[PDB]
């Protein structure tokens, strides 16, 4: 529950309100966000998450106000406001004020910024199960998808929903072109005959921190990994399947539909190598 | 800059600080939003905007605290705490605080509500002109296109940075297919040969009320009105261009690229109609 953002030059403690019910965010729709992770004293890949806060604040025409040191240096003062050994979520936010002329486009200019902390416990995943959804992924075209933008959620969402009607935790989620993009929280991953794939990236999903930190540790432990066009048939036929993220790095998937399935070795090595890393 | 919000069962003035740091819709995107107006005294389909309002809401997995009359009293209320001859833009909006199980899907128990009241001066339309746009319309199977809310905005946002960068204030529309849509604020209007020519709905844009509004007035004053499948080639050679939308309700489009266009006199019937009815 311990909480701590920052916001107008100050942390501050519990519910912060940042939102006006007339900031052009509220009801256009113009905040972007990321997600980094302090658990068991480490920081794992904080300045790259620092870094594409700003990122996806110019994919959303936003004008970023910080630095991605100083959001990083920002972010490491705020964890001294927890206990010790308090394991903590940090997400960086820039959001638009203002709109310009016309109104539904953000004003640059007008960019604000907060950074809000959550004390979370960094507990060892019992995975989640997957099941298809009737939705798909946007593309740049009719979406910016090129961004960890607050807007592209609601799809996942639905899928979401769609899931736990159906008696499922999450679900596998594909582009236009029916190839598996990811589940609807998280990069995807599979397993079989002792190679590793995933999606290739391309563009329709984030191809995410975490993902790259994986594939590459990975990689250097003597692991063949693929980044490749895979359909939901791959997934059909995968020794292991778990996901990528900010939250809790390595999570394996224990169910696709009908198909029952083990939290694997190789993900468990994948995991391990994580820590590892994280640690050295 | 005059502003009246109702926030939980309390009106205030100014700036109301609504979502939180911590919100799930502040950084997953779920709330959603009407708009109607006061102008000249009258608040024309206050009813139906407030009653879309909720629409929207189950539309993004909310669950509407209030009634769509209760709504229009309340705003009706509120719009009493404004100096006389004051033009209002009436803002309903509704949003989840917290997230399910999944984090991401909105937990509708936990839905708000917020009414914003901002005095913006109506004025008499001198027209506005568009150009193409590389953006596109979303569809119902990537995102929840259904519903007035404000995670479909930053899209037209490019869309109108995209005008702007050609010069121009405004965007004509396409959907998937490559059929006009609408504007990137607004629905559109188009006249040839005495009769007035409207993309005919598909799922891709909202079918407006104050579109619903002038075409029935058009039909009952003898104007054909037909809802077909337009192109730009038929924007192109078109006699008048028009848009509706609640903001300015009947509004001339005097410019397509390097063809101007007059104020038109089928689409000054359209306003004359409105603003006859408006006041009836």
Known sequence: ?????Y????????????????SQATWLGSLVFDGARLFEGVTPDLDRHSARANDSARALGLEPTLSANDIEALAREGLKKFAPDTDV????????EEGDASTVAPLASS????????????????????????????YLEVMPVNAKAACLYPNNARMLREAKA???????????????????????????GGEVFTPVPNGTF?????RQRVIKLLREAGVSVHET??????F??????????????????????????DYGLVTKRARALYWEWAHA
């Not at 916001?7 to 007339?22: F, N, P, Q, S, T």
């Not at 499922?168 to 991953?189: I, K, P, Q, R, Y």
């Open 1 to 5: 529950r311990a909480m701590w953002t």
């Open 7 to 22: 916001y107008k030059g100050e942390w501050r403690e519990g519910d912060v309100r940042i939102l006006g019910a007339a």
């Open 89 to 96: 979520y940090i997400r960086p936010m820039y959001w638009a």
């Open 111 to 138: 960019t604000d910024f907060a950074l809000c902390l959550e004390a979370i416990p960094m507990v060892e995943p019992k995975g989640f199960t997957i099941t298809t959804t009737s939705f798909r992924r946007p």
């Open 166 to 192: 159906k008696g499922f935790h999450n679900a596998l989620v594909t582009d236009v072109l029916g190839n598996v993009a990811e589940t609807a929280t998280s990069n995807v991953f599979m397993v079989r």
């Open 206 to 210: 984030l191809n995410g921190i975490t």
């Open 229 to 234: 066009t895979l359909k939901i048939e791959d």
């Open 236 to 261: 059909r036929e995968a020794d292991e399947i778990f996901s990528t993220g900010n939250m809790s790095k390595v999570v394996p998937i224990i169910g696709f539909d009908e198909r029952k399935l």
